[PDB]
Design a protein around this nucleic acid. Sequence first.
DNA 1: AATTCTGCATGGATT
DNA 2: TAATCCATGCAGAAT
DNA 3: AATTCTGCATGGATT
DNA 4: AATCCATGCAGAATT
DNA 5: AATTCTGCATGGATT
DNA 6: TAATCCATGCAGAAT
Lengths: 111, 111, 111, 111
Amino acid sequence: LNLNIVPLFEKTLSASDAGRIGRLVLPKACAEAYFPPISQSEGIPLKIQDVRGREWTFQFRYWPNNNSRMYVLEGVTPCIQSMMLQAGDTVTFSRVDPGGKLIMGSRKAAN
Amino acid sequence: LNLNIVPLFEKTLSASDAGRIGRLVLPKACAEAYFPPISQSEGIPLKIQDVRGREWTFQFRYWPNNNSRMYVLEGVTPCIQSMMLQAGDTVTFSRVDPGGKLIMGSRKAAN
Amino acid sequence: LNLNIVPLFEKTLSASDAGRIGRLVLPKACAEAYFPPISQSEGIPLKIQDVRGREWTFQFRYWPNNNSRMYVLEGVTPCIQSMMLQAGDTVTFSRVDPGGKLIMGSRKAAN
Amino acid sequence: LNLNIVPLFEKTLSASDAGRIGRLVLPKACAEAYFPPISQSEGIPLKIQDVRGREWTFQFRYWPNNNSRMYVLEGVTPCIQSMMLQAGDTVTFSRVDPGGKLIMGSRKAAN
DNA sequence: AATTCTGCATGGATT
DNA sequence: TAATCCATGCAGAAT
DNA sequence: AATTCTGCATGGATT
DNA sequence: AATCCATGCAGAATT
DNA sequence: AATTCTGCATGGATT
DNA sequence: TAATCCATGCAGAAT
């Protein structure tokens, strides 16, 4: 056995995503591409560690938006600014295979 | 099957660690607590991935010093340069189980 | 407020303890005297600090094994090795008061 | 090489401690009992490891207050936020030997 | 030549 | 004091 | 044109 | 009547 | 009353 | 233009 980290996708935080309300809008291509598929209104909870083993629990959810859905991680506020990261910076999602483990990272703006 | 990340230790890079000399000094308590034990001064190769998939292979090695040992990773220059680390930034090592895979991260210095 | 460590109990590591499977077999008297009570043998996740300050989360669990049980901590091998313990060395458990925080420690064998 | 944690003391975080001023009042009894002695208002830098192995540097310092002193750690807001603590939670300090290193941990309020 | 690379030595800071 | 640790110095070996 | 920083000062709250 | 600490607060320093 | 949170629905952006 | 996406606004809800 030998494991490998695979990057899945990335999101740069909007002002809305960052803090306050507590939800992060996931790019919908990426959300269904790499995260679990859900049809249920309020979808599954997701559990994801960072590189230091710090576990986080979000609710992975949709909103019907017109014809199609809008994807969110709810319950993000501790993670964002327990990792002390504000708006316009980027949060990253990767995966450990085999086993499909979700791990997240975070890069601050280029300047 | 469920996988789990545990933090191992951190090192804040000295000018020699980030220097062109291409070596990183590991604290001896941390090297023996968390990296595989080594008998021969000629070390062992260690492979370490970051969040973004970029794997590195360093030589984990020691030097006789007084009577005790001094521990180093050699071959970090590709890694330093690539994640763009300077002296005073911090490199962190944590580990994935089962499989004892080594993963690294980094935070930039506060100023 | 001022804090106090109370020693609870010791185990001499068996050849089966830690190792590839990574479980530490607890004497049933000590698990029920000192660890939180558990009804289902799935157990609970338990958090324990080692003599290095490091916190770990192991699974506190049993197997029924006829009427009586056999109790284990799972996920101990990185921690045991961190303390440089080998079979025949000793694993120790202590309590911090107030608060009953559990500490996992170690003294190596008489030779 | 005998490893051993010694617990030193605890403090319950006030709204000013958990606040964003970033100074933590050490009770003068504990501050003089366990931290290195300081003669002069201008403090010394102090390094404290957290339970997950990350190093933090605060300023250990005092203020004249009536005839006696009032002691503080400055620069705690990122660290306090890191442990997801708020007013009424508890911060604890221990001393890992060999090396006399300070460890800071924390348990959240009873609810 | 003169520079870089290797392996250990040494010394400032801390326990 | 006495001891330890680790950032860096600095002598050969090698470009 | 604030906010944050400082260096305390004051006062509520325990004995 | 003491003492200790959570917080007020009034200038200085920094947007 | 009056701020917080839920679940959308609107409309600028970016294919 | 065409269709979505996604940043955010904003009413019934709920504290």
